[PDB]
């Protein structure tokens, strides 16, 4: 699948907990962990639209109160080919 | 797909109607019908997360007004391997 | 994907807008545009169950206030194999 | 891996949700899914005491609202040698 699901959190502890819930919840793949700076850490998951909706909801519910908290939880069913240039392909 | 949808009903007639409605609604393969006992019958399907959401909604509606009715409708976007041992593989 | 999402409109302008919004919103392939007659235009897409849900809602919302308006917005997660004989496979 | 954690639910759907949440939370092996009769389903898991406490918390929270509901969530850090003669060791 190609549907993109993003969860942004204040700190890394919320991000890792969110990523654990997302991957555990549905058939999504962790494709990147971005340090936006200023204590914003984003985790991006790609999968089918049904899977990503479940994965993102699990991540938001799991990290909502972990650490500093949750900033944003978004789902994009189809990203424009232009945006792919700025999305990580695999995490490091 | 590996998402799991389950519908629990009081009696077998609602369960058969649920299983029929779920399979016809979306791409969900029927995997088992377990007699829990005490009047409970459960029908389990497997499929993609998006398909299971549509199938379970249809099955819940189909068996709501049949006999004693519906008890539980649940979707699991991903099921751990250890739980596979307690899930029917093919209906018998 | 099997899931079928059809949007029917009065006149072509809403159909093109509905077709545009549907495809952009989610990962659905446009399979046919049909002139039913009497001003009806039907736009059909095929994709995943989750993708089709996202697309059809996007298409239905977009074309409501465009032109004569929207007639219907229908989703079929799985169509009986027989119905696939009368469905278009690529727009012409 | 000795500590025993049991969750009892009314129906099989809440039991399967409890088993999934219990197993996802921590390293606990699912030992049995017992149909008690009268609608009771009991899922027993075994593992280290720390993991079991985490597993049972996840199961009690996950299956509380699913279906008829949760009946009992119980942990025994060490069972008497006599009791193990009445505990399942492999789920059937």
């Amino acid at each position: 699948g190609i549907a993109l699901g993003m969860i942004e959190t204040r700190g890394l502890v919320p991000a890792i907990e969110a990523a654990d819930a997302m991957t555990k919840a549905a058939e999504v793949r962790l494709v990147g962990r971005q340090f936006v700076g200023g204590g914003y850490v984003t985790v991006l998951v790609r999968g089918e639209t049904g899977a990503v909706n479940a994965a993102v909801r699990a991540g938001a519910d799991a990290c909502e109160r972990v650490g500093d908290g949750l900033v944003a939880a978004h789902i994009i069913a189809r990203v424009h080919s232009e945006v792919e240039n700025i999305l990580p392909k695999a995490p490091q | 797909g590996i998402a799991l949808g389950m519908i629990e009903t009081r009696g077998l007639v609602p369960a058969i109607e649920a299983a029929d409605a779920m399979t016809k609604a979306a791409e969900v393969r029927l995997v088992g019908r377990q007699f829990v006992g005490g009047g409970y019958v459960t029908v389990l399907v497997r499929g993609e997360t998006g398909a299971v959401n549509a199938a379970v909604r249809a099955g819940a509606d189909a068996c709501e007004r049949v006999g004693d009715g519906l008890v539980a409708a649940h979707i699991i976007a991903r099921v751990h391997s250890e739980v596979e041992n307690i899930l029917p593989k093919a209906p018998q | 994907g099997i899931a079928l999402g059809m949007i029917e409109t009065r006149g072509l302008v809403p159909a093109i807008e509905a077709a545009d919004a549907m495809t952009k919103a989610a990962e659905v392939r446009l399979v046919g545009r049909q002139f039913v007659g009497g001003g009806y235009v039907t736009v059909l897409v095929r994709g995943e169950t989750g993708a089709v849900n996202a697309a059809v809602r996007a298409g239905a919302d977009a074309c409501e206030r465009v032109g004569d308006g929207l007639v219907a917005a229908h989703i079929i997660a799985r169509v009986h194999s027989e119905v696939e004989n009368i469905l278009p496979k690529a727009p012409q | 891996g000795i500590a025993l954690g049991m969750i009892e639910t009314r129906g099989l759907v809440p039991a399967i949700e409890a088993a999934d949440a219990m197993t996802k939370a921590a390293e606990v092996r699912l030992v049995g899914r017992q149909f008690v009769g009268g609608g009771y389903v009991t899922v027993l898991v075994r593992g280290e005491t720390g993991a079991v406490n985490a597993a049972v918390r996840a199961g009690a929270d996950a299956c509380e609202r699913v279906g008829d509901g949760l009946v009992a969530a119980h942990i025994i850090a060490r069972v008497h040698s006599e009791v193990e003669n009445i505990l399942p060791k492999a789920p059937q």
Binding site: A25, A26, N53, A54, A55, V56, R57, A58, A60, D61, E64, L70, A72, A73, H74, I75, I76, A77 | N53, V56, R57, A60, A72, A73, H74, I75, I76, A77 | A25, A26, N53, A54, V56, R57, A58, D61, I75 | E17, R65, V66, G67
Partner: peptide
């Protein structure tokens, strides 16, 4: 009615044009 991951996060998600 139908429990699952679709019921977990309420009002915290964005960008979902889910039907109905």
């Amino acid at each position: 009615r139908i429990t699952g991951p679709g019921m977990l996060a309420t009002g915290l998600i964005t960008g979902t044009p889910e039907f109905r």
